[PDB]
Ligand binder design. Structure first.
Ligand SMILES: CCCCCCCCCCCCCC(=O)SCCNC(=O)CCNC(=O)[C@@H](O)C(C)(C)COP(=O)(O)O
Ligand code: SF4
Ligand code: SF4
Ligand code: FES
Lengths: 94, 83, 208, 117, 684, 112, 47
């Protein structure tokens, strides 16, 4: 969570009120609600799973408590396969 | 001072037959006689043929050419040219 | 077998069809069409002049004792010249059956009031007049119900926007609630949901 | 010469200053279905939409922004517009012209219609 | 010789060779399909078109089975429904569960046909297949895992686009569509594969994740990027343009739009002129109220008259704005109303409409036997016209010849050469192609507007008219003379009387120059007098705006209702999709407001009145979607011969030689980031 | 065509005259009862304006229907069904003047 | 919760905050999307 030049906390969306914008007045004696946890950083931090099959399935964990099951192709060595919903990354060993 | 002339005729209406005859026969001579005068020929539908003469400063006058023979159209255009 | 599909009762279908033919024979002056839906509901289509005669016939026992006006309403279909379709729902407690009578009208053509025959159609006709534009002739007291006292438009009319044209707020300058043109902070988002593929081939209209 | 304008209750600005478009909606080119192209539609002219200062939601002042009507035929829509006193523009229905399709043409001996794959 | 067939017992007369599906359309029944596109060739791989014919043991594919007399097509029999359910199940067996995140979601033929003709549950108890995604360019986001091998993309690329780079690799369930190599699918009509794809395997990268189909409001409009006049649907949500989709118009654009038309709307989101701007004391443009800037230009207009005040019209301006500005300048007795494109004024010029129109309409191209293209690259200048040419070439065996620089037109053509003298050679009859033209029953000659922009444009037009007159002498209803314009506003301006080319302004430098969206740069401050007062009225600030004393913000084609006339002479009206940004206003309203302030109030006060004025100036302008036209070739050719200009020896070279040129050709295209990305893609 | 209340335009005009009479005499009672701050003349002028709004109508049935609506509004005003807010809604006091010349409209907004 | 502890996740707050209405910590609504239309920047040179 970076801080804009005006001193506002930039959002994960990247939203920050410019110095010219008058809408910053709404936080004059109040606070701007910003979620410190950023999804992109946390999803980056997750280790890349290595699976020895060309096609793997990610349910997001928990079975019915996760996301619809999708099958990811891992043939490309250059780039790791990424779950559309979960965002976890997989690649074939070596 | 004439600035442009607009001629409106119907492609198949009987009223525009004379204007069509003027276009097919006399238009080439008219353009030769007045090389730089804009004589815009346009098609109008289910309305009487008309001749529009835009003078200096935007003043325009329209003369109905409905059921005019080619000679009558030539006379009308010549009168507009002479002023 | 076939648990999902609704069971069909043919006996009621035949009974309703026979009674519909009965009604058609008795009053051919007014009935234009009678049809029985496959969920066993009978509808009789009547010329606008026949609202009082046919309803009175249905109430009085020509083997029919429909003595209770279920509900009275209109359906505005703009395409038809008579954009309003006046709909009568009747229930016969003696024969434990219900039939529907339907008639049409325009914005400028009055329809005779049914207060005399049923007496329950007073408020129903008032609501029809207030929402739809239909005027009922010979009504004991035709005035607006369910709309504001000064309301100008006729809602439910398929032309009236859902948000209307006026909005009310309190104004401190005049110390009064004042109407103002509608200005929505979030425009109602129109969703185009109809699928490009036909769903029911049974109802396919002729190509024409 | 039917005029319901006085009786509708619509304010005069929308009666006079609005142009209503009568048309058959074109097929959404993303889909091959044609069921949504079989009925005439009446749609009003688009007006200003601005962002709400508080939340950025699109705000409007046009009451008839979302009003759309379905008509079986062009004449019915025209009659409705005339009776309501709305200036109307009618776009003629666009029908797919008949096409000549031959699976045999994909294997023409001398013509260019032969398909490489 | 109509034969009688029955669809569900209803008699329908169809011509021999009609497919079963077409007869079902004749009776109104839309047979479910996944591989059949009427524009494309028949393939018969979807298998969803399997319908039962009465008394026939085996179901047949409606898309690929010609009807036989006496056949009764049972479109809702149990066999037909069971076949549909089985095919749908096989399609959905391996298809990924990507509907929530697939951009196609909400407008997916697979989804709708599953809801209508498929089972409501899955018996597939095994793993699904997964396919590595292919990169085919910066425009089409590809998820091949969702592909159903409908082969629409392949057949489209082969037939319409003409680029044979997409194909099927492998066999069996492992068969994959896409380039076997890392090639990029580059073409004008490349974006149309996104539309043609039933599933979200091929989707729009700029449009990805932005919006869902049901949210969007659809507004029917006309494109302005080219003079083809393709009909489009502007999809807007919450007052913001989301995407541009093609709209079917069989005469103009069948179901396709150019890549620039499809993807340049992003330019409307950037470099917009939102407030009036006036030069301050330091010489810097500063935002000002409408009243102040309008008063400034009104005083300047009052001060000068005649040739002192002049107007230059850009490629993207509208007919209403044109006529408003024309009347305003005429009220100061100025006829120096000039377009940025040059059309030979000598001869009839703008006097006869047939002189500056594609007389043989785009639909006419199909009937033609021989087309001679002079100094034009139709693939880049008018992509849909080139697509029509290729369609005629593929189906009608059209013979095409080009006089100009050799370019890839996606179809084989005879390259006569690039020297203009070949026009004289054809006209005299020494050239062999003259004989082919004479033998041709329906010959067609097209002279691109770009060639006319050259110095020898008058001579080139005279030579082409000589070719056409020789053709007519050898052998009517058919028209052989056509001019292909590359700028939308050109035809309308010529109809309204705007003088083609900026030459008059060069002859008489004006004290006050009003730039109506003129970003071409033909005229600059150096050519003008030093103290020239320049007014710029346009949506984007590209070239004209930075050199303007007053900037009047104006609306774009998406933001106004206006009349644009295509190369065929067909007049079409755009419809308002979003409100003009900021303080910007519709152009004709701006001209009328300046007229009111300057004391010369134009008669029209509403859009309908402006259209009435257009009807006064040119009746064809208000006759929408009419290409009736008139034939005046005799008079124009006779006028042409009076002058004898000699063509220069420079070879005919189209301004656009490679697809890199096509992407950025106007203010909207230049502003777009997507077009810049495409330029980087092709260049690098 | 079936007449609502009048078979001819003249009869509808007679009904309009009656309705106008009734509104005219009711206006002072409305001012007194609702404690409105407008003058009787002002209200009657508004009545005249409202009546002239429908003057262009050239169909007897439409006139009759308008008369019915006028009668209903008059019954509301005669009773205290309408509040002071409803009565003053005729006088668009809060709403700001909307200029009608072209130049003012051009300045203010994109509206036609 | 002592008998059956809740599942431990990193994103879950470690200190529960009561209703903060009427306090400087009160939530203030605001748009979370960036500017849609970008205006032209006039050049800084006089000409
Ligand atoms: C606080 C004051 C509130 C004022 C409210 C008064 C009302 O309710 S206005 C309703 C009256 N409407 C009508 O009378 C409709 C008349 N329709 C017509 O067509 C007439 O103008 C006629 C028939 C042309 C006759 O016009 P003249 O009176 O001769 O010209
Ligand atoms: S393309 Fe496939 S994943 Fe996408 S919406 Fe259609 S069926 Fe669902
Ligand atoms: S990528 Fe799309 S268009 Fe191409 S074969 Fe697959 S489903 Fe068909
Ligand atoms: S698309 Fe018709 S058989 Fe496959």
């Amino acid at each position: 969570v970076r801080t804009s030049p005006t001193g506002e906390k930039v959002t994960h969306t990247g939203q920050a009120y410019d110095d010219g914008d008058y809408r910053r007045v709404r936080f004059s004696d109040r606070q701007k609600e910003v979620n410190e946890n950023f999804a992109i950083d946390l999803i980056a931090e997750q280790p890349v799973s290595e699976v020895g099959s060309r096609v793997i399935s990610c349910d997001g964990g928990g079975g019915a408590l996760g996301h619809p099951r999708v099958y990811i192709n891992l043939d490309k060595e250059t780039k790791t396969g990424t779950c559309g919903y979960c965002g976890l990354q997989f690649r074939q060993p070596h | 001072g004439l600035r442009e002339i607009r001629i409106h005729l119907c492609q198949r209406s009987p009223g525009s037959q004379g204007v069509r005859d003027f276009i097919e026969k006399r238009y080439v001579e008219l353009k030769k006689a007045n090389p730089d005068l804009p004589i815009l020929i346009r098609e109008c539908s289910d309305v009487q043929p008309k001749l529009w003469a835009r003078y200096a400063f935007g003043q325009e006058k329209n003369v109905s050419l409905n059921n005019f023979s080619a000679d009558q159209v030539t006379r009308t255009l010549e009168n507009v040219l002479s002023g | 077998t076939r648990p999902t599909i609704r069971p069909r009762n043919d006996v009621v279908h035949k009974q309703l069809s026979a009674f519909g033919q009965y009604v058609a024979e008795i009053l051919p002056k007014y009935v234009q069409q009678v049809q029985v839906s496959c969920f066993n509901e009978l509808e009789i289509f009547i010329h606008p002049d026949g609202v009082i005669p046919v309803l009175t016939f249905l109430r009085d026992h020509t083997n029919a004792q429909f003595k209770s006006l279920a509900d009275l309403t209109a359906v505005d279909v703009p395409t038809r010249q008579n954009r309003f379709e006046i709909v009568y729902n009747l229930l016969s407690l003696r024969f434990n059956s219900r039939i529907r009578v339907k008639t049409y009208t325009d914005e400028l053509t009055p329809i005779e009031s049914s207060v005399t025959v049923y007496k329950a159609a007073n408020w129903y006709e008032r609501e029809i007049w207030d929402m739809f534009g239909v005027f009922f002739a010979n009504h004991p007291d035709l005035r607006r119900i369910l709309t504001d006292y000064g309301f100008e438009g006729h809602p439910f009319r398929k032309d009236f926007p859902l948000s209307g044209y006026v909005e009310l707020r309190y104004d401190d300058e005049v110390k009064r609630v004042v109407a103002e043109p509608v200005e929505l902070a979030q425009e109602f988002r129109k969703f185009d949901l109809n699928s490009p593929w036909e769903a029911f081939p049974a109802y396919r209209q002729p190509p024409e | 010469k039917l005029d319901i304008t006085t009786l509708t209750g619509v304010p005069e600005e929308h009666i006079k200053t609005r142009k209503v478009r009568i048309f058959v909606p074109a097929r959404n080119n993303m889909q091959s279905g044609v069921n949504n192209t079989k009925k005439w539609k009446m749609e009003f002219d688009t007006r200003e939409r601005w962002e709400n200062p508080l939340m950025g939601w699109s705000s409007t002042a046009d009451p008839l922004s979302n009003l759309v009507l379905t008509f079986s035929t062009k004449e019915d829509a025209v009659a409705f517009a005339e009776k309501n006193g709305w200036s109307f523009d009618v776009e003629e229905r666009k029908v797919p012209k008949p096409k000549s399709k031959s699976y045999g043409a994909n294997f023409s001996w001398n013509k260019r219609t032969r398909v490489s794959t | 010789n109509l034969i009688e067939v029955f669809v569900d017992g209803q008699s329908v007369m169809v011509e021999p060779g009609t497919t079963v599906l077409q007869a079902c359309e004749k009776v109104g029944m839309q047979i479910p399909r996944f591989c059949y596109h009427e524009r494309l060739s028949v393939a018969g791989n979807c298998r969803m078109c399997l319908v039962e014919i009465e008394k026939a043991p085996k179901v047949v594919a409606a898309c690929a089975m010609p009807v036989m007399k006496g056949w009764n097509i049972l479109t809702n029999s149990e066999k037909s429904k069971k076949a549909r359910e089985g095919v749908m199940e096989f399609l959905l067996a391996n298809h990924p569960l990507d509907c929530p995140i697939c951009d196609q979601g909400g407008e997916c033929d697979l989804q709708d046909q599953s809801m209508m003709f498929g089972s409501d549950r899955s018996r597939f108890l095994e793993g699904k297949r997964a396919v590595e995604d292919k990169n085919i360019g910066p425009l089409v986001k590809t998820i091949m895992t969702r592909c159903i091998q409908c082969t629409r993309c392949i057949r489209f690329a082969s037939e319409i686009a003409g680029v044979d780079d997409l194909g099927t690799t492998g066999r069996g369930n492992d068969m994959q569509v896409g380039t076997y190599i890392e090639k990029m699918f580059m073409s004008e009509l490349s974006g149309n594969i996104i539309d043609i794809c039933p599933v979200g395997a091929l989707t729009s990268k700029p449009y990805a994740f932005t919006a869902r189909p049901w949210e969007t409001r659809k507004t029917e409009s006309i494109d302005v990027m080219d003079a083809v006049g393709s009909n489009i649907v502007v999809s807007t949500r919450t007052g913001e343009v989301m995407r541009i989709l093609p709209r079917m118009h069989e005469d103009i654009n069948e179901e396709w739009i150019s890549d620039k038309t499809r993807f340049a709307y992003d330019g409307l989101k950037r470099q917009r002129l939102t407030q009036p701007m006036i030069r301050n004391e330091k010489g810097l443009l500063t935002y000002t109220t409408w009243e102040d800037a309008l008063s400034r230009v009104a005083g300047m207009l009052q001060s000068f008259q005649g040739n002192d005040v002049a107007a230059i019209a850009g490629g993207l301006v509208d007919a209403e704005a044109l006529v408003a500005l024309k009347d305003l300048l005429n009220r100061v007795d100025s006829d120096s109303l000039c377009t940025e494109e040059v059309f030979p004024t000598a001869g009839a010029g703008t006097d006869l409409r047939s002189n500056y129109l594609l007389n043989t309409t785009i639909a006419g191209v199909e009937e033609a036997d021989v087309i001679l293209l002079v100094g034009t690259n139709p693939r880049f200048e008018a992509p849909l016209f080139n697509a029509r040419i290729r369609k005629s070439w593929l189906h009608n065996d059209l013979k095409v010849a080009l006089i100009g620089s050799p370019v890839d037109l996606t179809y084989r053509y005879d390259h006569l050469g690039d020297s203009p003298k070949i026009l004289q050679d054809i006209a005299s009859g020494n050239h062999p192609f003259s004989q082919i033209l004479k033998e041709a029953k329906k010959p067609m000659v097209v002279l691109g507007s770009s060639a006319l922009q050259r110095s020898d444009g008058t001579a080139i037009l005279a030579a082409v008219s000589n070719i056409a007159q020789n053709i007519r002498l050898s052998s009517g209803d058919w028209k052989v003379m056509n001019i292909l314009h590359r700028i939308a506003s050109q035809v309308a301006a010529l109809d309204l009387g705007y003088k083609p080319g900026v030459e008059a302004i060069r002859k008489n430098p004006p004290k006050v120059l009003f730039l109506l969206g003129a970003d071409g740069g033909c005229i600059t401050r150096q050519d003008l007098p030093k103290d020239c007062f320049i007014i710029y009225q346009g949506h984007h600030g590209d070239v004209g705006a930075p050199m303007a004393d007053v900037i009047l913000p104006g609306a774009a084609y998406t933001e106004k209702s206006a009349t644009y006339v295509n190369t065929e002479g067909r007049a079409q009206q755009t419809k308002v999709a979003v409100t003009p940004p900021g303080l910007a206003r519709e152009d004709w309203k701006i001209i009328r407001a300046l007229s009111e302030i300057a004391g010369m109030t134009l008669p029209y006060d509403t859009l309908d009145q402006v259209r009435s004025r257009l009807e006064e100036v040119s009746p064809n302008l208000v006759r929408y979607d009419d290409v009736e036209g008139a034939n005046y070739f005799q008079q124009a050719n006779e006028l042409s011969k009076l002058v004898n200009q000699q063509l220069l020896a420079d070879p005919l070279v189209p301004p656009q030689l490679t697809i890199k040129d096509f992407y950025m050709t106007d203010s909207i295209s230049r502003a777009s980031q997507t077009m810049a990305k495409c330029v980087k893609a092709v260049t690098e | 065509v079936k007449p609502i209340f009048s078979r001819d335009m003249n009869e509808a005009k007679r009904r309009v005259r009656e309705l106008y009479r009734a509104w005219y005499r009711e206006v002072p009672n409305t001012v007194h009862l609702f404690q409105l701050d407008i003058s009787v003349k002002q209200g009657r002028d508004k009545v005249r304006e409202m009546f002239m709004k429908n003057a262009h109508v050239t169909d007897p049935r439409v006139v009759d229907l308008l008369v019915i609506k006028g009668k209903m509004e008059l019954e509301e005003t005669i009773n205290v069904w309408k509040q002071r807010t409803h009565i003053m809604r005729f006088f668009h006091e809060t709403e700001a003047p909307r200029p009608t010349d072209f130049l003012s409209k051009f300045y203010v907004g994109h509206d036609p | 919760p002592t008998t059956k502890p809740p599942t431990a996740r990193k994103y879950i707050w470690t200190n529960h905050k009561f209703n903060v209405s009427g306090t400087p910590q009160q939530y203030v609504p605001y748009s979370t999307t960036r500017k849609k239309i970008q205006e032209w920047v006039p050049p800084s040179t006089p000409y």
